[PDB]
Amino acid sequence: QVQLVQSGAEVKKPGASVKVSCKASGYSFSSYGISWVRQAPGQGLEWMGWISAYNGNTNYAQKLQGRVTMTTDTSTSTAYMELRSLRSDDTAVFYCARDRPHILTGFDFDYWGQGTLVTVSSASTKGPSVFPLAPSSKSTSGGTAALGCLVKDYFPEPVTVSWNSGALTSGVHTFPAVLQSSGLYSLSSVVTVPSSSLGTQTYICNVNHKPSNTKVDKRVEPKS
Amino acid sequence: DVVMTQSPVSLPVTLGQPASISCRSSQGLVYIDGNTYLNWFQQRPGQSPRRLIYNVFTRDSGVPDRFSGSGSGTDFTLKITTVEAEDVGVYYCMQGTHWPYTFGQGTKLEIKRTVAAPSVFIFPPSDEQLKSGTASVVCLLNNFYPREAKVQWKVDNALQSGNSQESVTEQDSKDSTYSLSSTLTLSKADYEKHKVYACEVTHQGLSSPVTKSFNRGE
Amino acid sequence: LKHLLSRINHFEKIQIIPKSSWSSHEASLGVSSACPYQGKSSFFRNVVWLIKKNSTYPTIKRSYNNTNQEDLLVLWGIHHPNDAAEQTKLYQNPTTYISVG
Amino acid sequence: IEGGWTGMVDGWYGYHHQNEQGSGYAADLKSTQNAIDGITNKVNSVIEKMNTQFTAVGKEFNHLEKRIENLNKKVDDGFLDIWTYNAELLVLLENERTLDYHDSNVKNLYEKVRSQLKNNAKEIGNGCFEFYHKCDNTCMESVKNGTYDYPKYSEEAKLNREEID
Amino acid sequence: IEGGWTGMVDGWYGYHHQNEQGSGYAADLKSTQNAIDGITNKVNSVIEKMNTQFTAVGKEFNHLEKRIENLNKKVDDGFLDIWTYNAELLVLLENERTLDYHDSNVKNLYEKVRSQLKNNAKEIGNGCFEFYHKCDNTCMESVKNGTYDYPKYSEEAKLNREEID
Amino acid sequence: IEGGWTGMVDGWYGYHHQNEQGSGYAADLKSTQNAIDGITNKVNSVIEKMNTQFTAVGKEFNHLEKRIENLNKKVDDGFLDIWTYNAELLVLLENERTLDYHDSNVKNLYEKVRSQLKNNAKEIGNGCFEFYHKCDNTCMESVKNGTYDYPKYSEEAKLNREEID
């Protein structure tokens, strides 16, 4: 039924062409159209374009008309969005949605796709530098001593943090990454465990930066 | 061009409190077909957007009766009775019949409306990163009703702005309770220049601002 | 009045005047042919069908102040007989008036 | 053009291209889209009816023959059955204007193709252009896109006419 | 058909049959009768004007400038010259609708005879069908009654075309 | 006649005479002048709008809810936006009537020249009469003045037809 499979996450430098693909199936592709939507990082939803598989009726948004080029492969029932010129401002995640083909008919974004995020900055991939935290002042000893690791200095966005062989389940509040002003990233992953179990409970941040495959098992030590 | 103005951007609710979201258009949104076109969308955080009301008065197959699209003239509304927990998230108006398709701005929902009780913490930098060159200190706020606590930074009693960065979690499903992690990153030089790094946390649950000093040598 | 009601959602009754006021110089409300309350001939409950006392119906003057800080829809009526006997029996002075202010 | 096209379900105004390669129904994008924009704006603007304000207006005889009631009654009853009639007229009016607008767009497109093709084709049938020469798929696009060029195919077409002349 | 027929005094829409035997003016019965029914109903229905009720309405200044008089005056004077204009429009409206209805019935009958005859005749003149073959008096009735049959006279007609072809 | 004439700046309806001697644009005097008289009278008569008299009408609530004000208010506000709409319709109405009047005068003149010339010429182009014989400058005047005579040029024209026949 509902299957709008978007392409894989893509990373480029400003001024290079980007190509996103949304392959569709599990539902009749009777010329039904496809439109593409962009959500700036944690910001609004901006419609970018629409293409009718029935025809070649593209409607690129005034703002972005020259760069954007859209195509459809009816044989594979796959749509494609291509931004010829890239900008640091363009860095965002892109989304797909079905649309009705006939202009006479209205519109139906009934099915939506998996968000392909696209990053655009002049920075190469870098492995993260994991650094631990400690309950120096014992924090709220009578409550929960807090322990964290800092995953920093890395350029692609996808990161997966496993706490104590991922076994750690509650207490973990991994935080959203913030672009370091120099173009890098910084995650903070913290846990709240009562100060009773200082040495008994083991604390290990098992992080991996999938695009660079930096699988690193970091040590959390309770320096007070 | 079309302008979709969403009146109630910030909408905290309490479970079971029918609340409404208003979308107002610049021009009428009827089309040659005959039907209006304001299919409301909901993007539950972490998930991709979903459709609710087809046209202006048509619930979608997998949509709870609680969700109800309404409105006839430029001013349309969306009222959900028994506001539940998956109901929380961001919502957008639908693109106008004009080809300029306009989603408009967003409206966020809250789980309930309790008061704040944050557990503030601070984390001095381990010597490991203190050797790489970067020196960063994290202030932690575990739970309270809003998403902001004005964590301001005082280096040797000097407010530090810009060098700070704040990241925010979502309402814990168990209990509406956002968490914060303001970080201030600086060079080794500034770390060695100034021993004392007091923050300052400020929000509703606290009648007294809490600053945790955390000097360089402990 | 209907359009007045088209802008009213809630009413609350109040006792503007009592029956003691008119017992003092009048006679309690009587009945209505084929108009029992449920099973005993009666009258409207919000208005007083005043009658003369011992063939003595004097000119009666009274007034009320919305002391209550709220609008108060107040209602009265006038009896239009068809015979002079009817008036004489129900109201002794035959030349009458109801002066409202 | 006295016959409608069922195959042209993409847009109102369209062309039925026929080449040695095949035959299809291609709608004209600019004509349909611009017309749709204008018709939609007509519809939404016509909706504006802006009835008179709700001036909280009611009176009655007040037992003293205050016909203000029967006056205000007529006034509202007379504003309706007058505005309603007037509105029925505006519907009928706009209805025709959309219909003749449609016929005008038809004739404008037919003049467009006549202007480009000139004597490189025969006007035959109900709005059909029989090419003396062979308009390739691209050439068919060029006529549609308004980028058709008479000279390239001119001489070939001219000799064909003279053959049947 | 740009010319009226004076000889067709029986009904509006008619056919002028011409056979080897002779020439006559026969009106189409169903077209005229159905059209007469619709036009008559339009006429009687249009008559319904349903003026506002006689609400026993008059007032005057009463020597105290009770303009209710000049209000009620205008109200009646304004309802007329508005309804009258509006009624003039409805007359003009219905007038055209009857006229174009008539033209439509004409064209519908011409398509009826075209559909039956097909290529067994030539479209010549102002709505005249020259039969290649000889349509007998009955055959003329069959075309009129809608019971005309192409095949019987088809082959004869075809050979005649080929003779002048 | 689907094309306008810029050279005919003297009058609306005109003829483009062409003789062996030359070619000119002569407007028909009676048609233009009579039409101008009728159109001008339509314009001045339409102007008559005769608004209701200034009946010195105003009232207000008088602190006792004398809605005569909101009544008289609506009455004036309702007479306008009704008369205005109604007037917009009358403009549109007269507009079309002038336009179709113009088209009718065109067709009347074309029938005039057809009636005089009959089979002494060919109907060719968009309202052009190709004379089989040679209509002299006077002869061109005679057609214009309605004084054209078929017989004089008849036999000459007939032989020319038979030559191309």
Q: Which helix (H) or strand (E) holds F150?
A: helix F150-164
Of A187, A175, A188, nearest to B168 by C-alpha is A175
User: What is the spatial distance between Cα C75 and Cα C64, in angstroms, rounded to a whole number?
Assistant: 13
Residue B48 CA from chain centroid, whole number: 16
User: What is the spatial distance between Cα F38 and Cα C49, in angstroms, rounded to a whole number?
Assistant: 78
Sign of CA dihedral D123, D125, D129, D134: negative
| 3-class SS of residue F47 | helix
Order across the sheet with A92-99: list the strands. A10-12, A116-120, A92-99, A33-39, A45-51
User: What is the spatial distance between Cα A219 and Cα D111, in angstroms, rounded to a whole number?
Assistant: 80
Burial C51-76 (b: 16+ CB within 10 A, else e): bbbeeebeeeeeeeeeeeeeeeeeee
Residue B39 buriedness (CB in 10 A; 0-12 / 13-18 / 19+): buried
Structure-derived torsion over alpha carbons of residues D104, D109, D112, D116, reported in degrees to the nearest 10: -160
User: What is the spatial distance between Cα E141 and Cα E144, in angstroms, rounded to a whole number?
Assistant: 5
Query: Which residues share a beta bridge with F131?
Result: F121
User: What is the spatial distance between Cα D50 and Cα D52, in angstroms, rounded to a whole number?
Assistant: 6
Number of H helices, E strands in chain C: 3, 2
> How many other CB atoms sit within 10 Å of the CB of residue E74?
19
Chains D and B touch (3+ CB pairs under 8 A): yes
If phi > 0 it is left, if psi is from -120 to 50 it is alpha, else beta; for residue B152 that is: beta
Q: Which helix (H) or strand (E) holds A118?
A: strand A116-120
Query: Which residues share a beta bridge with A95?
Result: A37
Provide the terminal-to-terminal Cα distance of chain A, rounded to the nearest Å.
56
Number of H helices, E strands in chain E: 5, 4
Chain D interface test: which of B25, B26, B30 (most D C-beta within 10 Å): B30
Of F122, F159, F121, nearest to F139 by C-alpha is F121
Find, in chain A, the residue whose alpha carbon is nearest to that of B185.
Answer: A180
| HEC sequence for A20-72 | EEEEECCCCCCCCEEEEEEECCCCCEEEEEEECCCCCCCCCCCCCCCCEEEEE
User: What is the spatial distance between Cα B212 and Cα B140, in angstroms, rounded to a whole number?
Assistant: 11
User: What is the spatial distance between Cα A12 and Cα A19, in angstroms, rounded to a whole number?
Assistant: 11
In sequence order, the 6+-apart residues with CB closer than 8 A to the CB of A123 are A155, A183, A184
Count CA atoms closer than 13 A to D39's CA, side-chain side. Answer: 21
E67, E74, E89: residue with CB nearest F68: E67
Strands A145-152 and A160-163: unpaired
Chain F interface test: which of D48, D55, D71 (most F C-beta within 10 Å): D55
Distance from the B211 Cα atom to the nearest Cα atom in chain A, whole angstroms: 13
Q: Are the C-beta atoms of E27 and E119 separated by less than 8 Å?
A: no
Q: Angle CA(B107)–CA(B113)–CA(B114) in degrees, nearest 5?
A: 145
E71, E86, E92: residue with CB nearest F75: E71
Q: Are the C-beta atoms of A82 and A19 separated by less than 8 Å?
A: yes
User: What is the spatial distance between Cα B180 and Cα B141, in angstroms, rounded to a whole number?
Assistant: 5
C-alpha distance from residue A192 to each of A143, A195, B141 (Å)? 9, 9, 11
Distance from the E123 Cα atom to the nearest Cα atom in chain F, whole angstroms: 20
User: What is the spatial distance between Cα D127 and Cα B99, in angstroms, rounded to a whole number?
Assistant: 31
Asked if D87 is an interface residue toward chain F (Cβ–Cβ < 8 A), one would say no
Of A13, A90, A16, A102, nearest to A48 by C-alpha is A90
Query: Which residues share a beta bridge with A21?
Result: A80
- In D8-37, the residues whose Cβ lies within 8 Å of chain A are 9-12, 26-27, 29, 32-33, 36
Provide the terminal-to-terminal Cα distance of chain C, rounded to the nearest Å.
19
Q: Are the C-beta atoms of A120 and A58 separated by less than 8 Å?
A: no
Residue A121 buriedness (CB in 10 A; 0-12 / 13-18 / 19+): middle
Query: Which residues share a beta bridge with A216?
Result: A207
B31, B43, B136: residue with CB nearest A106: B31
Q: Are the C-beta atoms of B26 and B95 separated by less than 8 Å?
A: no
In sequence order, the 6+-apart residues with CB closer than 8 A to the CB of B67 are B40, B42, B52, B53, B59, B78, B80, B87
User: What is the spatial distance between Cα B132 and Cα A130, in angstroms, rounded to a whole number?
Assistant: 11
Structure letter (DSSP) for residue F148: -
B41, B181, B212: residue with CB nearest A175: B181
Determine the residue type at A44: G
CA-derived radius of gyration, chain E: 28
Chain D interface test: which of F62, F66, F70 (most D C-beta within 10 Å): F70
Asked if E57 is an interface residue toward chain F (Cβ–Cβ < 8 A), one would say no
In sequence order, the 6+-apart residues with CB closer than 8 A to the CB of C53 are C25, C26, C27
Asked if A54 lies within 8 A of D10 by C-beta distance, the reply is yes
Distance from the C32 Cα atom to the nearest Cα atom in chain D, whole angstroms: 24
- Residues ending a continuous segment of chain F before a break (C–N > 2.5 Å): none
User: What is the spatial distance between Cα A184 and Cα A157, in angstroms, rounded to a whole number?
Assistant: 9
Structure letter (DSSP) for residue E118: G
Q: Are the C-beta atoms of D153 and D133 separated by less than 8 Å?
A: yes
Query: Which residues share a beta bridge with B19?
Result: B80
| Resolution attained, angstroms | 3.6
Tokens 């363009």 -> residue: A90
Alpha helices in F20-149 (DSSP H): 29-47, 68-79, 83-117, 137-144
